[PDB]
């Protein structure tokens, strides 16, 4: 029979770097109905966002 004892100390020094590039499109919509005592309106909107 045999017994083994072991100790281990590890020093790990690590580097990392990164880039990233995002390209974002977007198409918005809107409708609106306004109403007052004697004033009524309506509105339609649309939006085109690049990024």
């Amino acid at each position: 029979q045999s017994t083994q004892n072991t100790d281990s100390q590890t020093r790990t020094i690590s580097k990392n770097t990164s880039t990233s590039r995002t390209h974002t499109s977007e198409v918005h919509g809107n409708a609106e109905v306004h109403a007052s005592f004697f004033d009524i309106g309506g509105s339609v909107s649309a939006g085109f966002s690049n990024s």
Binding site: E26, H34, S36, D39, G41, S49
Partner: peptide
């Protein structure tokens, strides 16, 4: 100034819109 008052009431009849950021 009646015409100016009518223009002011017409301007009041609406919204100054909203401030939205999509950053």
């Amino acid at each position: 100034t009646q015409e100016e008052h009518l223009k002011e009431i017409m301007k009041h009849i609406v919204k100054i819109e909203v401030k939205g950021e999509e950053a």
